[PDB]
Write an enzyme that holds these catalytic residues in place. Structure first.
Site, PDB file in Angstrom:
ATOM      1  N   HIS B  87      29.490  71.562  76.645  1.00 52.47           N
ATOM      2  CA  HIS B  87      30.371  71.195  77.754  1.00 52.47           C
ATOM      3  C   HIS B  87      31.504  72.185  77.825  1.00 52.47           C
ATOM      4  CE1 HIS B  87      28.433  67.284  78.254  1.00 52.47           C
ATOM      5  NE2 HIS B  87      28.551  67.129  76.921  1.00 52.47           N
ATOM      6  N   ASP B  90      36.827  73.235  83.749  1.00 51.63           N
ATOM      7  CA  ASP B  90      37.244  74.090  84.844  1.00 51.63           C
ATOM      8  C   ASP B  90      38.327  73.288  85.573  1.00 51.63           C
ATOM      9  OD1 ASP B  90      37.530  75.277  87.504  1.00 51.63           O
ATOM     10  OD2 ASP B  90      35.384  75.186  87.966  1.00 51.63           O
ATOM     11  N   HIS B  92      40.662  73.320  88.918  1.00 50.81           N
ATOM     12  CA  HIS B  92      40.918  73.947  90.211  1.00 50.81           C
ATOM     13  C   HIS B  92      42.373  74.378  90.386  1.00 50.81           C
ATOM     14  CE1 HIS B  92      37.215  72.163  92.572  1.00 50.81           C
ATOM     15  NE2 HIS B  92      36.799  72.804  91.458  1.00 50.81           N
ATOM     16  N   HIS B 127      36.635  69.648  86.299  1.00 48.00           N
ATOM     17  CA  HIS B 127      35.272  69.208  86.061  1.00 48.00           C
ATOM     18  C   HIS B 127      34.593  70.104  85.025  1.00 48.00           C
ATOM     19  CE1 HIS B 127      33.279  72.290  88.634  1.00 48.00           C
ATOM     20  NE2 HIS B 127      34.263  72.066  89.496  1.00 48.00           N
ATOM     21  N   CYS B 128      33.522  69.613  84.431  1.00 49.23           N
ATOM     22  CA  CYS B 128      32.722  70.451  83.564  1.00 49.23           C
ATOM     23  C   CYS B 128      31.848  71.356  84.414  1.00 49.23           C
ATOM     24  CB  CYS B 128      31.873  69.512  82.741  1.00 49.23           C
ATOM     25  SG  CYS B 128      30.841  70.287  81.473  1.00 49.23           S
ATOM     26  N   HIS B 138      26.166  67.973  85.336  1.00 46.74           N
ATOM     27  CA  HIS B 138      27.263  67.427  84.549  1.00 46.74           C
ATOM     28  C   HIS B 138      28.305  66.758  85.438  1.00 46.74           C
ATOM     29  CE1 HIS B 138      26.659  69.278  80.373  1.00 46.74           C
ATOM     30  NE2 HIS B 138      25.513  69.445  81.027  1.00 46.74           N
ATOM     31  N   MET B 143      31.442  63.991  84.864  1.00 46.77           N
ATOM     32  CA  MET B 143      32.362  64.852  84.159  1.00 46.77           C
ATOM     33  C   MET B 143      33.315  65.506  85.147  1.00 46.77           C
ATOM     34  SD  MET B 143      30.535  66.404  80.842  1.00 46.77           S
ATOM     35  CE  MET B 143      32.112  66.608  80.055  1.00 46.77           C
ATOM     36  N   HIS B 248      40.104  55.160 103.702  1.00 47.84           N
ATOM     37  CA  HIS B 248      40.684  54.288 104.708  1.00 47.84           C
ATOM     38  C   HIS B 248      41.200  53.054 103.990  1.00 47.84           C
ATOM     39  CE1 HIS B 248      41.124  52.211 108.595  1.00 47.84           C
ATOM     40  NE2 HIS B 248      40.707  51.156 107.950  1.00 47.84           N
ATOM     41  N   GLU B 272      44.691  56.796 110.271  1.00 46.58           N
ATOM     42  CA  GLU B 272      43.816  55.644 110.046  1.00 46.58           C
ATOM     43  C   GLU B 272      42.871  55.958 108.893  1.00 46.58           C
ATOM     44  OE1 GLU B 272      40.949  54.616 113.445  1.00 46.58           O
ATOM     45  OE2 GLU B 272      41.461  56.682 114.130  1.00 46.58           O
ATOM     46  N   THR B 273      42.222  57.116 108.943  1.00 45.30           N
ATOM     47  CA  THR B 273      41.219  57.554 107.980  1.00 45.30           C
ATOM     48  C   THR B 273      41.486  59.033 107.717  1.00 45.30           C
ATOM     49  OG1 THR B 273      39.632  55.942 108.874  1.00 45.30           O
ATOM     50  CG2 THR B 273      38.718  57.868 107.783  1.00 45.30           C
ATOM     51  N   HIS B 299      35.063  55.343 104.677  1.00 47.11           N
ATOM     52  CA  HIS B 299      34.673  54.719 105.924  1.00 47.11           C
ATOM     53  C   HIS B 299      33.362  55.247 106.472  1.00 47.11           C
ATOM     54  CE1 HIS B 299      35.147  52.305 109.525  1.00 47.11           C
ATOM     55  NE2 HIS B 299      36.288  51.803 109.105  1.00 47.11           N
TER      56      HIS B 299
HETATM   57 CU    CU Z   1      29.545  68.726  80.587  1.00 46.66          CU
HETATM   58 CU    CU Z   2      37.300  50.208 109.874  1.00 45.81          CU
HETATM   59 CU    CU Z   3      34.871  73.185  91.039  1.00 44.88          CU
END
Ligand code: CU
Ligand code: CU
Ligand code: CU
Ligand SMILES: OC[C@H]1O[C@@](CO)(O[C@H]2O[C@H](CO)[C@@H](O)[C@H](O)[C@H]2O)[C@@H](O)[C@@H]1O
Ligand SMILES: OC[C@H]1O[C@@](CO)(O[C@H]2O[C@H](CO)[C@@H](O)[C@H](O)[C@H]2O)[C@@H](O)[C@@H]1O
Ligand SMILES: OC[C@H]1O[C@@](CO)(O[C@H]2O[C@H](CO)[C@@H](O)[C@H](O)[C@H]2O)[C@@H](O)[C@@H]1O
Ligand code: NO2
Ligand code: NO2
Ligand code: NO2
Ligand code: CU
Ligand code: CU
Ligand code: CU
Lengths: 334, 334, 334
Positions: B87, B90, B92, B127-128, B138, B143, B248, B272-273, B299
């Protein structure tokens, strides 16, 4: 308790929108609307495929309701005894009680009256949401529409300039899930209840059989094309209650676009394609510069051309050769 | 070389978030975190379906890490010998070496220590990502988590006003791919390795079997509902490491929303969303105005109701009849 | 009628872009481009799967065309007699006649000349659109590219500061639909016409078999990796003519991003992942801070790793240990 003037609205079927003011000198009012639920078997394509629809006011989408910020919207929801299922209504524009759904559950033979204050500007979805697995089923069966909450000073560009439309259309997009039999033919059902098991199995696979505007393939074409003239500013409100869409006016642009649909935010300018999040409405305005046919599509072109999601505009006026010209017509290669 | 004060953080399981300051008078620190990988068979639905999960700190999502701009984040990643696979991690939020992945690949029985400077504000996925086809596997096995990098002056509305939340929740959404046998029943596997072939075949078809918050259908419901009171400003951080989502709050709004999740950009208002791009985190804040139950959903209502992607808030306080009222309860149609 | 200077452009194959000015002291010109349609069977993956491609200038995507606001773009579209089908071209940047499509339909053996005025700034898709069900088929067969319409003062950050790139790359993403036989092997076809029935049946199910950059799995890797140096500002233009994408630079960021692709709008800052709506182009700029390998992906990681949608950058320069460092290399757990 609430002592304000009352105003009744006569709703009209989409894609048209009931008459309204943009900028207004009116103060807050109680604006009264009535929606009557209709469950009905309808035809959704030019091959004659049928669908067990569930609708507000007999249409997919339900009608556009238009009010101004600070109005109180009072809706009478009616579920006639000719229907089979309980229904309710949830407004994304409203605050509390699951958007109203927790206060409007009605059996066949009943009606209910809900009031909500329009504290948030923009275009918003409304939809039925009876509870549990019924929620997606009622929505994708057609039970959704939109409301537009205007600023009292009308729309602006964010940059103190007014943005006034000459006309507004409401394009409601519906993802539909029609199961197929062993042959590969679409199935027909005698009731919404009978369509439920097969339809839910398909729904959970997340791929619609049809994606349509105004309830049917080709609804907004031919005699029912949308219309404009060169020089007209048109507002197109677009909603999708369950699934994303990517509107595009072929041959035009979104001159001013609120893709998240909310007028407290400035519009973006000069878009080619915009994005309506599933569970939302957005709005785009365009001033037509050229006559002729335009297609208004979702720009997943498979959905547009093959699954049903194309509308047309027919535009009158004078061709502008500065903007575009055929310098040399099709000819044999030298 | 780097001579700054060191501060240890005790991570807590989602949806809760470890205690932190918003606006701070502290200067840059080295903030120390530990993540211990756990591979484990878990139950993901109320029917008892099992899943071969791979997690940071035993949870899906992994815990939210909170720091301020200009801090140095020092993570000890631990891969105990009880696991079967290599494993890595990473971030971002980080710059270089594939987000750290190229510097943190560890076999069972090993640990590694990575430091990165928090130069970019916002909420970010981690994330892995071990390499090749293992990367999606993964991630969709669980992960992934998120980190929040706050401005030292706290959040603002873009328009010089401060935006202070009373509480923050982290909702990690996971798309899961559980294959079915010939009967149509979900399959169970004795190890992640044994689940790999069938799971990859399903993954490449791009349709999840489940979409869940906090690792399981119904995780953020009942006793584990999210809570608030009328008048409280709540920040909801939402991440999705692989697939789009459209959050939402049913009965509410996003009063201030960073849907791309980055605090160098002003928030949008009154949504709203909103839309969380696969591979990102976003954040929305809302001040509760009404008591009662709210549902927090993606939604796509099929995913929300039928595939697992619904959380609840239970909110205490006084009902506001100005904002919404049942004018007439369900009654027989006149 | 139109008496302006004429300038010819020599188009180059993606991911490279023909030489151009950013900010310019030139006034409007008629900029002349030629596109020659080529239908051809190509290999799209490292296993040798073949595909019936349809292309502008022999490439997927078609080449990037670059002009400035207020230029007139004059395109000669050529459909040699060696092709089998009619074709046309629709520019999202243009106004009227379905983007030009209604004025450029040409049979094998014909050519046509279209001029349009570049009134809208940004990056825009162009694509073939012959009519009806042919529209999606031609697009997903490869017949799409992009044009970039620059402000005459070059790019800015919205906040009066100039944004000048050192180099620009065009990454065109293509969703491809290759049917499988009973065995489970990808099918090969002798002509585009013969591929049509099976390909349309698959297309309507909305799940691609491949998602690739620059026409093939691994196209922008190895010898054909994208390149940069620490300190270089790189503009990445990304288009997708049919389906959404979520670009992400692994180990970097989008320092300035126009995800809807239109330079009349200020860029967003400091993104992890951005969103290209199907039927649009967007652009992101990043100044490299670290050397090494970066992957540029759509952050649906199944698509990236398993379906083909990964490019690499190889970056030269000095490692910055302040930004990131391996404090302790992999070691046995104490
Ligand atoms: Cu992993
Ligand atoms: Cu709705
Ligand atoms: Cu990524
Ligand atoms: O278009 C909304 C956008 O415009 C700004 C000005 O940049 O505010 C205008 O719109 C508000 C809402 O209608 C008005 O109240 C305000 O007076 C007007 O300037 C932004 O604040 C807003 O996000
Ligand atoms: O909310 C971010 C947004 O607000 C602006 C002002 O319009 O800048 C504020 O936030 C910055 C980042 O926190 C501060 O550095 C700045 O002092 C403050 O005005 C925008 O520049 C920014 O996009
Ligand atoms: O980046 C575009 C964004 O910047 C603003 C200033 O906030 O305007 C700049 O860009 C315009 C288009 O290039 C110029 O015409 C203008 O002079 C310049 O200030 C915004 O108006 C625009 O949305
Ligand atoms: O129900 N048809 O008008
Ligand atoms: O691993 N269960 O707590
Ligand atoms: O057509 N091949 O170069
Ligand atoms: Cu209903
Ligand atoms: Cu073509
Ligand atoms: Cu198009």
């Amino acid at each position: 308790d609430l002592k304000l003037p009352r105003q009744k609205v006569e709703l009209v079927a989409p894609p048209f929108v009931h008459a309204h003011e943009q900028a207004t000198k009116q103060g807050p009012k109680i604006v009264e609307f009535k929606l009557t639920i209709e469950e009905k078997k309808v035809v959704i394509d030019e091959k004659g495929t049928t669908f067990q629809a569930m609708t507000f006011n007999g249409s997919m989408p339900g009608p556009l309701m238009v009010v101004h910020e600070g109005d109180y919207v009072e809706t009478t929801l009616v579920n006639p005894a000719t229907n089979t299922m309980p229904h309710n209504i949830d407004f994304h524009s409203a605050t509390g009680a699951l958007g109203g759904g927790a206060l409007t559950l009605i059996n066949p033979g009943e009606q209910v009256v809900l009031r909500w204050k329009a504290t948030k500007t923009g275009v918003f979805v409304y939809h039925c949401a009876p509870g549990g697995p019924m929620i997606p089923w009622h929505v994708v069966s057609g039970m959704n529409g939109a409301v537009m909450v205007l600023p009292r000073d009308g729309l602006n560009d964010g940059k103190g300039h007014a943005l006034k439309y000459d006309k507004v259309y409401y394009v409601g997009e519906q993802d539909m899930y029609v199961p197929r039999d062993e042959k590969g033919n679409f199935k027909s059902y005698d009731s919404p209840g009978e369509a439920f098991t097969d339809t839910e199995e398909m729904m959970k696979k997340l791929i619609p059989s049809h994606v349509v505007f105004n309830g049917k393939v080709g609804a907004l074409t031919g005699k029912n094309a949308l219309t404009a003239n060169v020089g007209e500013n048109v507002l197109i409100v677009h909603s999708q209650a369950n699934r994303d869409s990517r509107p595009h006016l072929i041959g035009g642009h979104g001159d001013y676009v609120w893709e998240t649909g909310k007028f407290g935010n400035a519009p973006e300018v000069g878009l080619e394609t915009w994005f309506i999040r599933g569970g939302s409405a957005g709005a785009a305005m365009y001033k037509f510069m050229q006559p002729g046919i335009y297609a208004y599509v979702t720009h997943n072109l498979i959905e547009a051309a093959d699954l049903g999601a194309t509308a047309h505009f027919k535009v009158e006026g004078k061709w502008n050769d500065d903007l575009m010209t055929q310098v040399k017509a099709p000819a044999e290669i030298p």
